[PDB]
Amino acid sequence: KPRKVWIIYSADHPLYVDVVLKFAQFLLTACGTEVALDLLEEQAISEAGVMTWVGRQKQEMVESNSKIIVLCSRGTRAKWQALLGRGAPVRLRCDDLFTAAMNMILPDFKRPACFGTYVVCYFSEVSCDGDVPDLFGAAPRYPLMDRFEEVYFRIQDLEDNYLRSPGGRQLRAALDRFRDWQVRCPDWFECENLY
């Protein structure tokens, strides 16, 4: 049985969604890791609840000793602030499973035994440390891809080089493309936010 993983993220813009999908594919084609990703299960999410689906993903990871990757970004920051009632609610065009997933995993962060399940990341090219919700507090943060090595170790239970691995250049092209856009359109996030 290959390593399985659940990716949690905020769908901030079609370009960042593509970054996320390319990462998922990199994990599969470069690391032989199976990924639970909401993009890939729209039907299941449709029929079962969104809460039912999120609850089902977490359950499968924890009981199989598999990791939950938290991908942090501009949207995870804003959605967390909203959850805290210290920022307006967010209504993103691409949406909200990140908020649902945050509700689901929340209690785990008063449980030290549960921290090793979570792998807290953000892509340094398009996102920043300040994007990580303080819910994760003292959990290690991995700037990707600078520190993907460490994330790999955790996914594998152990103890720009990825560009030559299958799917690495595609992920990097996706990163570059979103980055250039944030430069071209600095208010990209605010444009994604409806009402």
Residue numbers in the entry: 376 to 470, 477 to 540, 556 to 591
Article passage:
Here, we report the crystal structure of a fragment from the IL-17RA intracellular signaling domain including its SEFIR domain and a short C-extension at 2.3 Å resolution. Besides the complete SEFIR domain (residues 376–540) of IL-17RA, the structure reported here additionally includes a short C-terminal extension (residues 556–591) of about 35 amino acids. The longer helix αF is sandwiched by two short helices, αE′ and αG, in a Z-shaped crank shape. This predominantly helical C-extension of SEFIR packs tightly against helices αA and CC′ins and loops CC′, DD′ and EE′ through extensive van der Waals interactions, stabilizing the overall architecture. In contrast to the complete disorder in the structure of IL-17RB SEFIR, the unique and long insertion between strand βC and helix αC in the IL-17RA SEFIR structure is mostly well ordered, displaying a helix (αCC′ins) and a flexible loop (CC′). The most striking observation when comparing the two SEFIR structures is the absence of the knot feature in IL-17RA SEFIR. The DD′ loop in IL-17RA SEFIR is much shorter compared with that in IL-17RB SEFIR.
SEFIR-mediated protein–protein interaction is a crucial step in IL-17 cytokine signaling. The IL-17 receptor (IL-17R) family comprises five members (IL-17RA to IL-17RE) with considerable sequence divergence, which are all membrane-bound proteins containing single transmembrane domains. IL-17Rs contain fibronectin type III (FnIII) domains within the extracellular portion and a unique structural motif within the cytoplasmic tails termed the SEFIR [SEF (similar expression to fibroblast growth factor genes) and IL-17R] domain.
